[PDB]
Design a protein around this ligand. Structure first.
Ligand SMILES: *[C@@H]1O[C@H](CO)[C@@H](O[C@@H]2O[C@H](CO)[C@@H](O)[C@H](O)[C@H]2NC(C)=O)[C@H](O)[C@H]1NC(C)=O
Ligand SMILES: *[C@@H]1O[C@H](CO)[C@@H](O[C@@H]2O[C@H](CO)[C@@H](O)[C@H](O)[C@H]2NC(C)=O)[C@H](O)[C@H]1NC(C)=O
Ligand SMILES: *[C@@H]1O[C@H](CO)[C@@H](O[C@@H]2O[C@H](CO)[C@@H](O)[C@H](O)[C@H]2NC(C)=O)[C@H](O)[C@H]1NC(C)=O
Ligand SMILES: *[C@@H]1O[C@H](CO)[C@@H](O[C@@H]2O[C@H](CO)[C@@H](O)[C@H](O)[C@H]2NC(C)=O)[C@H](O)[C@H]1NC(C)=O
Ligand SMILES: *[C@@H]1O[C@H](CO)[C@@H](O[C@@H]2O[C@H](CO)[C@@H](O)[C@H](O)[C@H]2NC(C)=O)[C@H](O)[C@H]1NC(C)=O
Ligand SMILES: *[C@@H]1O[C@H](CO)[C@@H](O[C@@H]2O[C@H](CO)[C@@H](O)[C@H](O)[C@H]2NC(C)=O)[C@H](O)[C@H]1NC(C)=O
Ligand SMILES: *[C@@H]1O[C@H](CO)[C@@H](O)[C@H](O)[C@H]1NC(C)=O
Ligand SMILES: *[C@@H]1O[C@H](CO)[C@@H](O)[C@H](O)[C@H]1NC(C)=O
Ligand SMILES: *[C@@H]1O[C@H](CO)[C@@H](O)[C@H](O)[C@H]1NC(C)=O
Ligand SMILES: *[C@@H]1O[C@H](CO)[C@@H](O)[C@H](O)[C@H]1NC(C)=O
Ligand SMILES: *[C@@H]1O[C@H](CO)[C@@H](O)[C@H](O)[C@H]1NC(C)=O
Ligand SMILES: *[C@@H]1O[C@H](CO)[C@@H](O)[C@H](O)[C@H]1NC(C)=O
Ligand SMILES: *[C@@H]1O[C@H](CO)[C@@H](O)[C@H](O)[C@H]1NC(C)=O
Ligand SMILES: *[C@@H]1O[C@H](CO)[C@@H](O)[C@H](O)[C@H]1NC(C)=O
Ligand SMILES: *[C@@H]1O[C@H](CO)[C@@H](O)[C@H](O)[C@H]1NC(C)=O
Ligand SMILES: *[C@@H]1O[C@H](CO)[C@@H](O)[C@H](O)[C@H]1NC(C)=O
Ligand SMILES: *[C@@H]1O[C@H](CO)[C@@H](O)[C@H](O)[C@H]1NC(C)=O
Lengths: 680, 99, 198, 49, 49
């Protein structure tokens, strides 16, 4: 059973910053005393984290409001808890959290954890009640109050509890617990750690390395999750429904993982002791571009680590016409191999999913194009080339294959760049008594050229004696029949083969894939997928002139930089989502933390446009504009103030301008030591 | 202007090559990273991508070596020019045909 | 283990870079599987007369599967642009379907049993070894050692290196295993190159 | 001969015309190593077993 | 693949060593000239020593 939730005092939850916590070993490979550079999924430094109070404390004059929202599980979740008396028990994961879809459950009802992969029918607001009270039928009770039923369960795992429990010392919020959940390759990975904190709230700006805890091979689709509470007040929900929300104090912090590049550092024990988020600030990017945690005084030309594409768009021509695969594969009869029918497939959408409950393809060998990337690859020319052959000869339909069929009948070329499909059809064109209608050439004075057809019907000069047009002693008819008795082994049953020859060109798309289209981002950093053509960059309207049949135009050296949208016929322009001219000026890590930024050959009006400050972290947006807007002859120098003095050069910057870290704290009334940019 | 122009041209020319050499296939099916990524799945496009990476890295190494050699030659020329400046402008030289 | 029974024609779809009915809606083998796929015909074991009709398979799905995913859904497929709730309407099919193993079909329809083993080589104590036996332990000469799934030439020597309880080997500065742990004695060894070039 | 005792024969003094073996059998496997199947009609050998 | 990569690395190291050796050879020639012109005698060249 379950009880509903008449909460009315709900308010928008607060937000905090994940300073440096949320770093986990993103692999199983042992590493000792090495500085590695991975770009797996990590929680960004100083990232936004949502704070939930869950229960509302009834001590402050009495509040009985429960707030347990359902949260998205976008590609990894970081969960932090500061409670002490086991207020947070476990978690539930799933897609619909119903009996129609399998789900995952983790519960710590006693000094051992239980994990189940059943198909629970979760109620609206699950919770956990009875904990421990003697003489009340509540001491050591393994009640659930979470799911109504559970059927068709797959994986169950009972083991040691995650962390230490009990030790109730109210007012301290001790035992800060951190977890990272990541569902990849079917494996559900939980990384865990706990530290003895004593602060009331506002998690300290400290670094925590999360050792791996479990790797469950559950293999389920997880997109939403919820937190399991321990709503006891000495038993479940007392009295009638609700009126049982009192559980002391509750609070948990939720953050979402994003693909980021890190500089994790390992000690002699193989434990991560420090890390650098190669997105947070120019100092971190300078550390990453030279792979060291200590940066000395000077200027450094960093790599590109600021902007990462976050949205993907797809633009395919608006056709919406299913391809006649049913009209070809389900034909009454196919042409014989010696005279193979060639058909121009056009104006299709090429949905292979249609041909599933009709046939089972025994061979789907694709050349030049991977079978996986066939649903998102628009073509410009497709041919069918269908014919029926013997089973043992189906292997002869290959580029570099020789044999009777591949030398006298078909002779597939060496750059076919298509897909060969072949399926058994002993139940369709193998009538009783022998079909004897599918002919094949057996004799030929030479071999066949690629994609050639020879309907000759001549007399083969097999012997050294002319015979005119009669079957003599050494003069055979070139063609012969197979004979499809519906009793021969699989080595003689008729196999139907269709060989599609794709053609990717700078021409308008004709045969696309089942993939649909999305909206059109026009000023941000996106992963675009135009006609069979994907790439990362920034789109922009342009005045480029395009030929009527042209689809895309390249750069100086084979780099497609101006595509034509297939849905609006307007010309776009692709610019790289990277401006490498950023030079970081640092007085040394063991002298200060402030840095100066020099964007190459840009005035201080296009810098937010140039480096895409709208897609960057706020710390970078600090180094985009502001008060220090000094302009030089080699791009302007946001980050440092300009003085009218003429001190000696300390750190070279560009044409004439230098910079130095000066102890202006004595000269200036309030401003401390700072970076200055004088002239040499 | 002679050699004073030449070095500049050389540098520019080198850079131009470093761009015009991005179209070399290096054994890959096509010298376009986007085309390979759109046509082939990761497990099979990986080898082509490594081929392109090796070719472009070798190109960068060749450019760096050429730059190092040219920088050595320019360093020798600059040392000669500094000696001439400190010996024929800041004084008088008795060396025959030096200035 | 990951054992299941499929149709003969579809046994070629158990591959990393393969697409098809099972490869998109049922199994979806990953791209770094680094294991071994075994498959054998079993028309004489689970193809009873009259049709087995017990081995089910998914045919409809609103999308593809992520690698190593399992989908026991039992829903109604929205094949048509008309909601139908939980009844088999005009364009609403049951997703799962039966094969039917009559012991008379061709080899393209006979049941094939497939087991896909996914190995995992790590710096962890060995669990599933091979039939190869063990030998003695040379401790001061130049030998070709083969410790847990790990072979190499060198000279072994006793050492005072400190190893974590689960650790099995330790490498050099640049990815060169130089200190292995003997599995039979749990003592720590040290590998020096069998070559002094000076 | 059975697989456990396979017969080894020295083929010599041939012209090795595979076109003869077309209206006799259908080779279910013709997999070649080191030498391409296409370039087998113009490659003299020195030892065949 | 590994052999080709490591051979390329060795070639790069050898080329860098050759360039550095050329620079050091030039510096040593300058040092020898200074040693035989300012220690074994007196130089009238301005700012040479
Ligand atoms: C926690 O709850 C689970 C079920 O949600 C309990 O599981 C079984 O409980 C019975 C009796 O309580 C035991 O005999 C079984 O051994 C338990 N496990 C299984 C797999 O059936 C569990 O006992 C509860 N308490 C814990 C885990 O400490
Ligand atoms: C879980 O799935 C099974 C079937 O996979 C359902 O249980 C029964 O399973 C047998 C075969 O093992 C069938 O013959 C029965 O018809 C099934 N019973 C039914 C369909 O009611 C079970 O119903 C499923 N559970 C849920 C909650 O749907
Ligand atoms: C195309 O036709 C020409 C002419 O008929 C063929 O060339 C003949 O080939 C035969 C057998 O190889 C020779 O005996 C003749 O002497 C050739 N005559 C000439 C004029 O070349 C050629 O082989 C045919 N090509 C194909 C692929 O069928
Ligand atoms: C295919 O889709 C395009 C849009 O991508 C359709 O273009 C629309 O044309 C009508 C009539 O001119 C406009 O009112 C719409 O505003 C256009 N699209 C939008 C949403 O902006 C096109 O009509 C569709 N049909 C085909 C097959 O071309
Ligand atoms: C995992 O579940 C999510 C949510 O149910 C699936 O995303 C849905 O996919 C269908 C078909 O692709 C769309 O019609 C829905 O709009 C999607 N909903 C959401 C919320 O994303 C996702 O496809 C599933 N993934 C797998 C591998 O099964
Ligand atoms: C693994 O098995 C070997 C079998 O030889 C064990 O080695 C023996 O250990 C006993 C007890 O120390 C000695 O008395 C024998 O003389 C050893 N035989 C030899 C030559 O190896 C070994 O101890 C076992 N190790 C583990 C961890 O079980
Ligand atoms: C986090 O996002 C919220 C909006 O959901 C925003 O109000 C808040 O300012 C962001 N982070 C902080 C604490 O600045
Ligand atoms: C809450 O009430 C709604 C009625 O709108 C019901 O559908 C739901 O099941 C209830 N929740 C629980 C946990 O019983
Ligand atoms: C992070 O939050 C703390 C308060 O908890 C604040 O003092 C600190 O300045 C914040 N840092 C950033 C840049 O987010
Ligand atoms: C490694 O672990 C050992 C065992 O506790 C400990 O003594 C040592 O200080 C650790 N080293 C580091 C660098 O943490
Ligand atoms: C194929 O064509 C036949 C013609 O009678 C039709 O009955 C069948 O439904 C079609 N679909 C299949 C089985 O491909
Ligand atoms: C396939 O088509 C047949 C004939 O219409 C039908 O009986 C069967 O249920 C279909 N299977 C699926 C799930 O498509
Ligand atoms: C920084 O410099 C001071 C003074 O030399 C030194 O005592 C300290 O150990 C240094 N720390 C770092 C981070 O190198
Ligand atoms: C862009 O920078 C140049 C460099 O001096 C400057 O002259 C020009 O005014 C700047 N553009 C604008 C719009 O101010
Ligand atoms: C130098 O002095 C002039 C005159 O007041 C002022 O306009 C300019 O901003 C000063 N430059 C500095 C302080 O860098
Ligand atoms: C092929 O061999 C069969 C078997 O005897 C024979 O009947 C047939 O006539 C032969 N065909 C040719 C073209 O020689
Ligand atoms: C094998 O030889 C016998 C007699 O020499 C002949 O009857 C038969 O047709 C031959 N078979 C083949 C496949 O050549």
């Amino acid at each position: 059973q379950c009880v509903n939730l008449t909460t009315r005092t709900q308010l928008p939850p607060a937000y905090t910053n994940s300073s440096t916590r949320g770093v986990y070993y993103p692999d199983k490979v042992f590493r000792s005393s090495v500085l590695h550079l991975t770009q797996d999924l990590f929680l960004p430094f100083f990232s936004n984290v949502t704070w939930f109070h869950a229960i509302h404390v009834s001590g402050t004059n009495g509040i009985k409001r429960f707030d347990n929202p359902v949260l998205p599980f976008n590609d990894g979740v970081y969960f932090a808890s500061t409670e002490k008396s086991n207020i947070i028990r476990g978690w539930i994961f799933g897609t619909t959290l119903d009996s129609k879809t399998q789900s995952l459950l983790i519960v710590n009802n006693a000094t051992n954890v239980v994990i189940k992969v059943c198909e629970f029918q979760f109620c609206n607001d699950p919770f956990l009640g009875v904990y421990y009270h003697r003489n009340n039928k509540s001491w050591m009770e393994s009640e659930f109050r979470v799911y109504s039923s559970a059927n068709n369960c797959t994986f169950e795992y009972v083991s040691q509890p995650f962390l230490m429990d009990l030790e109730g010392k109210q007012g301290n919020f001790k035992n800060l617990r951190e977890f990272v959940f990541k569902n990849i390759d079917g494996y559900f990975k939980i990384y865990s750690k706990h530290t003895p904190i004593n602060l009331v709230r506002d998690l300290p700006p400290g670094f925590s390395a999360l050792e791996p805890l479990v790797d469950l091979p559950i293999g389920i689709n997880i997109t939403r999750f919820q937190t399991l509470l321990a709503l006891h007040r000495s038993y479940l929900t007392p009295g009638d429904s609700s009126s049982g929300w009192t559980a002391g104090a509750a609070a948990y912090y939720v953050g979402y993982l994003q693909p980021r590049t890190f500089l994790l550092k390992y000690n002699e024990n193989g434990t991560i002791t420090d890390a650098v988020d190669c997105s947070l600030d120019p100092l971190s990017e300078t550390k990453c571009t030279l792979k060291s945690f200590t940066v000395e005084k000077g200027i450094y030309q960093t790599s590109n680590f600021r902007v990462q594409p976050t949205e993907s768009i797809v633009r395919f021509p608006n056709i919406t016409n299913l391809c006649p695969f049913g009209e070809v594969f389900n034909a009454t009869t196919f042409a014989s191999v010696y005279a193979w029918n060639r058909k121009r497939i056009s104006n299709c959408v090429a949905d292979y999913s249609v041909l599933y409950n009709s046939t089972s393809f025994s061979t789907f060998k694709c050349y030049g194009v991977s079978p996986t990337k066939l649903n998102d690859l628009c073509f410009t020319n497709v041919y069918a080339d269908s014919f029926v052959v013997r089973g043992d000869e189906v292997r002869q339909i290959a580029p570099g294959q020789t044999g009777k069929i591949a030398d006298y009948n078909y002779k597939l070329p060496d750059d076919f760049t298509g897909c060969v499909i072949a399926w058994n059809s002993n139940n369709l064109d193998s009538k009783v008594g022998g079909n004897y209608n599918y002919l094949y050439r057996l004799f030929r004075k030479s071999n066949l050229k690629p994609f050639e057809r020879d309907i000759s019907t001549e007399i083969y000069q097999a012997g050294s004696t002319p015979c005119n047009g009669v079957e003599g002693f050494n003069c055979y008819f070139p063609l012969q029949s197979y004979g499809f008795h519906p009793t021969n082994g699989v080595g003689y049953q008729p196999y139907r083969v269709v060989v599609l020859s794709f053609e990717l060109l700078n021409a308008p798309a004709t045969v696309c894939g089942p993939k649909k289209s999305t909206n059109l981002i026009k000023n941000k950093c996106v992963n675009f997928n135009f006609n069979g053509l994907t790439g990362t960059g920034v789109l922009t309207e342009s005045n480029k002139k395009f030929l009527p049949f042209q689809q895309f135009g390249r750069d100086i050296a084979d780099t497609t930089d101006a595509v034509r949208d297939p849905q609006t016929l307007e010309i776009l322009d692709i610019t790289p989502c990277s401006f490498g001219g950023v030079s970081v000026i640092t007085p040394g890590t063991n002298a200060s933390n402030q840095v100066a930024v020099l964007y190459q050959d840009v005035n201080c009006t296009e810098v937010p446009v140039a480096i895409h400050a709208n897609q960057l972290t706020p710390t970078w947006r600090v180094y985009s504009t502001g008060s220090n807007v000094f302009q030089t002859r080699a791009g302007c120098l946001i980050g440092a103030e300009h003085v009218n003095n003429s001190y000696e050069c300390d750190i070279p910057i560009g044409a004439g301008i230098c910079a130095s870290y000066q102890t202006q704290t004595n000269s200036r009334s309030v401003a401390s030591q700072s970076i200055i940019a004088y002239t040499m | 202007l002679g050699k004073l122009q030449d070095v500049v041209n050389q540098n520019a020319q080198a850079l131009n090559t470093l761009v015009k050499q991005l179209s070399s296939n290096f054994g890959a099916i096509s010298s376009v990273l986007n085309d390979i990524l759109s046509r082939l799945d990761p497990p099979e496009a990986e080898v082509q991508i490594d081929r392109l990476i090796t070719g472009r890295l070798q190109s960068l190494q060749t450019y760096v070596t050429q730059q190092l050699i040219r920088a050595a030659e320019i360093r020798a020329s600059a040392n000669l020019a500094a000696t001439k400046m400190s010996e024929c402008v800041l004084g008088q030289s008795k060396r025959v045909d030096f200035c």
